[PDB]
């Protein structure tokens, strides 16, 4: 078990430290609750619980959570909800140009990544791809990578208008394109149970669904606008057991083949014992041989220089993540980490500060009526994850708003409260048992904006 | 307080030991639960509860019963259900030719006893009558001794066919008959409250109901078959306070008089100070004087030699039980033992291994729809017995199947699950509060067959 020459050691250590700290903050709540349940409800109950909470979780608890526990029993569910919300707040607060130039040199003025809403793909940008979130990098996760065409088209139009009017990334005459990346996931160890649940854990079904959505988006962009407007499409598959990516190389015209791809597992295997420059040569030629391969991978021409450079950089970055997983877990995630191990249900736009693998179940929705199935899937997952142990389900309803648009924050807060009430009236049996805990938050759309808590009522 | 010369001392000691052990196994659960309720739900709750259970009940508990008790509170109801099921299993496991010859010498090839479903009559065979359960001795208990004519006729036909084809008890030409015994019960101390609840605690009502059912069965056998096919009928009353039987002596033609009977209390009183052979002479003549008495006991002729010998043996056997009660409780059962003191509700065919007085409430039924009133009576009894103390009601659904018939075991298991679900949907308020605990079991119809637990779902 040696180290790859291209591994980013200090970045790996930093990422591991952040992951460990956040997961520990979320996980230490349960032992504290178990200790609390053994404290008699005497006259010293409140003081003892408060000092124990200060010693364990680093914060105290509101007296309303403990004031009437002597007559109403231990308020373990309320303490759990409060502690989970505090852990999420602490994680976000603790988290809180070169990428644009690199994208421009590769021939793109904007990169749009649409991975699956699976929790195992949450850390796709900071861990698997090592791509920072910039003003021109977007991450819109959907269930089964089934991203919506209309909003992507609107984003494309907005970016093109910005290029035409101000040329913020670059002037409109530059021959750069809009890059849309679709990410599917699969499990090598358990293909039939640990795959994409949106497609019945069928690897090829997820692959073809993502490819079809990419093709539909490209054709919609072509149809909606004239003068030969077009976009570039990229397809990436992630093995959730080893966090290794296979990138489907487009041909000269940009079409993607489900069989023409570069797999980073064999690349890591065959570049382990070489030297940095030689490994870079290896991946540079390997992209070419994969793109020029025949048979089922028959492709017309070869991909552009920018495409190949971008894919090579992606593979080099993913090598560090493969090495990170090998170091931390001996080459494969533990059996508990292979499946669902989420700590809370994220509803709305999600958090850009806690992009950690298998931390939360994300349900991209603006209305419960439109995407109820995501909420039901999350509740079903947490029924086994949490309700089996008797713990309540924590739900963070987070939304982003644009401060430039007048009245946007109030509308966003109203939307958050509406979502909270809709999730309340559904699963009303779980509500009556206090098995659902909520926290509502809003944030400005700018990167690094503070997160503001809002009252549930 | 001296001992009757005909008392079976070692048999009495053995029976008392078994009764004490079984009742202690069932009764020691509650103090253990009360001790458990005082254990704080700390980190040592599971270990302490398990070691206490091992020390007290002789067995441990599944972790699922205690794993989430810290957040859901003490699972006293679940532990109660599990411990009661384990006690029943232990009692059955601990329990697990001459009689046929004696029956044949008395002129019967099969004996069928149909006592009331009252719990105080549960130990009628091993204690009150000292009659072992053989391949030709049957015990079908019904509420109010209201045994069903059709199944008795079917059993008679099966036995007669076996005699004709193989002659297993004896050849068909032998002048033996099928003996049907009906047992009613009454209370001397509290006639109006501790009598047969199926007849409003009216002694004469129970007597005439049992006599009418016996007459109906005899006439049905006579009508259904020609060549003068007939059966012998016997009527027995049991005083639940002293476990003493009065046997109604049939006349020469087999008819029974509600007033012509031999009472074993006066027999025990008048045979206490004599010697064995003299006491046997006394009961032999006493049968004759009772059968030859006039007035309201006017009967045509005298009973046969086999009938009188059988009745004399029954009285001699019941003398030992009278002596047993006198020894253990000073001549009468304690006031708590006079009424209802059952530990669980037996539904189905009952257990032949725990035939102990006042141990369980038995509800002979194959469908809740047909005999719902028995279930309601049992639930009403246990509402005062158990629900007053806050304990749940334990219910053992036990059924017997014939392994010779293909597919019988699966059908029996399906029937048990159907009965369990039907009892669940009724009394749904008790179900939601976890006040009903169930255990489902099946057993082969052969005597001594193992009891197999089945899953509730
Ligand atoms: Zn998925
Ligand atoms: Zn009765």
Place of tokens 């209370």: B187
* Cα atoms found within 13 Å of the Cα of residue B346, Cβ hemisphere only: 26
Contacts of B73 in chain A (CB under 8 A): 73
Name the maximum alpha-carbon separation found in chain B.
80
- CB proximity list for A301: less than 8 A, separation 6 or greater: A251, A252, A253
Q: How far is CA B262 from the centre of its chain?
A: 23
Q: Is B116 annotated in some ligand binding site?
A: yes
Please give the Cα distance from B83 to B56 (Å, whole number). Answer: 11
Q: Which SS3 state, helix, strand or coil, does residue B291 take?
A: helix
Pairing of strands B137-139, B108-115: parallel
Please give the Cα distance from B322 to A334 (Å, whole number). Answer: 70
Label residue B389 exposed, middle or buried (CB < 10 Å: 0-12, 13-18, 19+). Answer: exposed
Helix then strand then coil, % of chain A, to nearest 5: 50, 15, 35
Closest C-alpha among B140, B136, B168 to residue B152: B140
**Nearest by CB to B41, which of A37, A389, A391?**
A37
The residues facing A261 across adjacent strands are: A248
Q: Which SS3 state, helix, strand or coil, does residue B309 take?
A: helix
Please give the Cα distance from A237 to A207 (Å, whole number). Answer: 8
* Cα atoms found within 13 Å of the Cα of residue A297, Cβ hemisphere only: 16
Q: Which SS3 state, helix, strand or coil, does residue A400 take?
A: strand
Size (chain B), residues? 457
Contacts of A40 in chain B (CB under 8 A): 40
Please give the Cα distance from B332 to B325 (Å, whole number). Answer: 7
Instruction: Name the strands in the sheet holding A451-454, side by side, starting at the edge strand that comes first in the sequence.
Output: A360-363, A344-348, A393-401, A436-444, A451-454
Please give the Cα distance from A252 to A291 (Å, whole number). Answer: 9
Buried b (16+ CB within 10 A) or exposed e, B78-92: bbbbbbbbbbbbbbb
Q: Do B70 and A37 touch (CB under 8 A)?
A: yes
Place of tokens 């075991």: B409
Q: Do B71 and A35 touch (CB under 8 A)?
A: no
Please give the Cα distance from A443 to A397 (Å, whole number). Answer: 11
Q: How far is CA A265 from the centre of its chain?
A: 22
- CB proximity list for A245: less than 8 A, separation 6 or greater: A128, A129, A236, A237, A238, A239, A264, A314, A315, A318
Instruction: Name the strands in the sheet holding B177-186, side by side, starting at the edge strand that comes first in the sequence.
Output: B137-139, B108-115, B177-186, B232-239, B244-248, B261-263
Please give the Cα distance from A54 to A59 (Å, whole number). Answer: 5
Token readout for B94 is 């601990």
The DSSP secondary structure of A149-208, one letter per residue, reads: HHHHHHHHHHHHHHHHHT-SSS-TTS--EEEEEEEEEE-SS-TTTSS-GGGTT-HHHHHH
Q: How far is CA A68 from the centre of its chain?
A: 40
CA of A265 to the centre of ligand 1 (A): 21
Contact A281, A351 (CB under 8 A): no
Please give the Cα distance from A279 to A273 (Å, whole number). Answer: 9
Q: Do A38 and B70 touch (CB under 8 A)?
A: yes
Contacts of A79 in chain B (CB under 8 A): none
Other Cβ atoms closer than 10 A to A451: 17
Other Cβ atoms closer than 10 A to A433: 11
The method recorded for this entry reads cryo-EM
Please give the Cα distance from B248 to B181 (Å, whole number). Answer: 11
Of the residues B8, B118, B251, B374, only one is catalytic, namely B118
**Nearest by CB to A389, which of B40, B68, B73?**
B68
Label residue A188 exposed, middle or buried (CB < 10 Å: 0-12, 13-18, 19+). Answer: middle
Size (chain A), residues? 457
CA of A200 to the centre of ligand 1 (A): 9
Residues of B (30-69) whose Cβ lies below 8 Å from A: 40-43, 45, 67-68
- CB proximity list for B450: less than 8 A, separation 6 or greater: B96, B443, B444
Q: Which SS3 state, helix, strand or coil, does residue B90 take?
A: helix
H runs (alpha helix) in B136-195: 149-165
Q: At what angle do helices A9-27 and A29-36 cross, to 10 degrees?
A: 20
The residues facing A112 across adjacent strands are: A138, A180
Contact A144, A172 (CB under 8 A): no
Q: Do A34 and B70 touch (CB under 8 A)?
A: yes
Contact A338, A195 (CB under 8 A): no
Please give the Cα distance from A123 to A121 (Å, whole number). Answer: 6
Kindly state the helix (H) or strand (E) to which residue A353 belongs, with its residue range: none
Q: How far lies B188's CA from each of B127, B141, B241, B244, in Å? A: 19, 22, 7, 11
Contacts of B43 in chain A (CB under 8 A): 34-35, 38
The DSSP secondary structure of B21-72, one letter per residue, reads: HHHHHHHTHHHHHHHHTTS--STTHHHHHHHHHHHHHSS---GGGTTTHHHH
Please give the Cα distance from B63 to B48 (Å, whole number). Answer: 12
Closest C-alpha among B312, B393, B378 to residue B340: B378
Contacts of A34 in chain B (CB under 8 A): 42-43, 70
Q: Is A227 annotated in some ligand binding site?
A: no
Contact A415, A399 (CB under 8 A): yes
Q: How far lies B430's CA from each of B78, B344, B415, B433, B436, in Å? A: 14, 15, 22, 5, 6
Q: Kindly identify which residue of chain B lies nearest to residue A433, measuring between CA atoms.
A: B72
Closest C-alpha among A305, A306, A304, A264 to residue A286: A264
Token readout for A203 is 């690897």
DSSP letter (8 states) at residue A84: H
Closest C-alpha among A379, A369, A366, A250 to residue A304: A250
Q: What angle do CA B405, B411, B414 make, to 5 degrees?
A: 165
Contact A230, A218 (CB under 8 A): yes
Please give the Cα distance from A360 to B257 (Å, whole number). Answer: 82
Based on the residue annotation, tell me whether A118 is a catalytic residue of this protein: yes
Q: Which ligand is nearest to the CA of A377?
A: 1
Q: Which ligand is nearest to the CA of A117?
A: 1
Q: How far is CA A104 from the centre of its chain?
A: 24
Q: How far lies A59's CA from each of A85, A88, A394, A453, in Å? A: 12, 13, 19, 17
Token readout for B61 is 């508990």
- Under the phi-then-psi rule, with left for phi > 0, alpha for psi from -120 to 50, and beta for the rest, what region is A98? alpha
- CB proximity list for A407: less than 8 A, separation 6 or greater: none
The residues facing A436 across adjacent strands are: A393
Name the maximum alpha-carbon separation found in chain A.
80
Backbone φ and ψ of B196, nearest 5°:
-75, 110
Helix then strand then coil, % of chain B, to nearest 5: 50, 15, 35
Q: How close A39 gets to chain B, by Cα (Å)?
A: 8
* Cα atoms found within 13 Å of the Cα of residue A446, Cβ hemisphere only: 5
Please give the Cα distance from B251 to B254 (Å, whole number). Answer: 5
Closest C-alpha among B457, B351, B371 to residue B414: B457
Looking at chain B, the number of H-run helices and the number of E-run strands are: 15, 11
Please give the Cα distance from A132 to A139 (Å, whole number). Answer: 11
Please give the Cα distance from B264 to B256 (Å, whole number). Answer: 18
Closest C-alpha among B137, B333, B309, B307 to residue B239: B333
Cα dihedral B3/B8/B14/B18 (nearest 10): -80
Q: Kindly identify which residue of chain A lies nearest to residue B67, measuring between CA atoms.
A: A389
Contact B189, B332 (CB under 8 A): yes
Please give the Cα distance from A172 to A193 (Å, whole number). Answer: 47
Please give the Cα distance from A263 to B360 (Å, whole number). Answer: 69
DSSP letter (8 states) at residue B238: E
Please give the Cα distance from B181 to B120 (Å, whole number). Answer: 17
Q: Is B185 annotated in some ligand binding site?
A: yes
Residues of B (69-128) whose Cβ lies below 8 Å from A: 70-73
Please give the Cα distance from A282 to A6 (Å, whole number). Answer: 12
Token readout for A403 is 């401060």
Please give the Cα distance from A305 to A288 (Å, whole number). Answer: 11
């Amino acid at each position: 078990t040696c180290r790859h020459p291209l591994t980013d050691l200090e970045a790996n250590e930093q990422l591991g430290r952040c992951e460990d700290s956040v997961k520990n903050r979320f996980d230490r709540v349960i032992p504290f609750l178990q200790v609390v349940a053994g404290i008699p409800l005497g006259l010293d109950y409140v003081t003892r619980v408060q000092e124990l909470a200060q010693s364990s979780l680093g914060h105290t608890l509101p007296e309303e959570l403990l004031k009437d526990n002597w007559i109403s029993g231990h308020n373990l569910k309320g303490i759990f909800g409060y502690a989970t919300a505090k852990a999420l707040t602490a994680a976000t607060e603790q988290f809180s140009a070169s990428a644009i130039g690199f994208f421009l040199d590769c021939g793109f003025h904007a990169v749009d990544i649409s991975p699956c809403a699976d929790g195992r793909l949450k850390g796709l940008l900071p861990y698997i791809l090592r791509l920072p979130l910039t003003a021109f990098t977007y991450r819109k996760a959907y269930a089964g990578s089934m991203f919506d065409i209309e909003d992507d088209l609107a984003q494309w139009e907005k970016n093109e208008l910005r290029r035409y009017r101000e040329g913020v990334p670059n002037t409109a005459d530059q021959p750069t394109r809009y890059l849309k990346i679709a990410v599917y996931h699969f499990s090598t160890s358990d293909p039939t149970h640990s795959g994409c649940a949106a497609h019945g854990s069928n690897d090829r079904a997820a692959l073809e669904a993502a490819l079809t959505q990419l093709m539909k988006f490209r054709e919609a962009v072509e149809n909606a606008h004239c003068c030969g407007a077009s976009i570039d499409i990229l397809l990436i598959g992630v093995d959730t057991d080893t966090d290794a990516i296979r990138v489907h190389i487009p041909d000269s015209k940009g079409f993607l083949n489900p069989y023409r791809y570069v797999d980073n597992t064999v690349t890591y295997a065959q570049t382990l014992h070489l030297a940095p420059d030689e490994a870079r040569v290896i991946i540079h030629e390997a992209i070419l041989n994969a793109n020029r391969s025949d048979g089922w991978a028959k492709g017309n021409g070869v991909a552009s220089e920018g495409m190949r450079r971008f894919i090579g950089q992606l593979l080099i970055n993913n090598l560090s993540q493969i090495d990170y997983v090998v170091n931390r877990h001996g080459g494969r995630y533990p059996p508990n980490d292979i499946g669902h191990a989420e700590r809370y249900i994220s509803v709305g736009d999600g958090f850009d500060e806690v992009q950690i693998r298998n931390l939360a179940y994300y349900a991209h929705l603006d209305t419960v009526e439109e995407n109820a199935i995501d909420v039901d899937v999350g509740i079903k997952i947490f029924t086994k994850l949490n309700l089996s142990r008797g713990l309540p389900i924590p739900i963070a309803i987070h939304y982003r708003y644009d401060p430039n648009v007048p009245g946007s924050r109030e509308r966003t807060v109203v939307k958050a409260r509406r979502i909270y009430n809709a999730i309340k009236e559904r699963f009303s049996s779980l509500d009556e048992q206090n098995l659902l805990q909520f926290r509502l938050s809003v944030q400005a759309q700018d990167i690094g904006s503070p997160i503001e808590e809002v009252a549930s009522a």
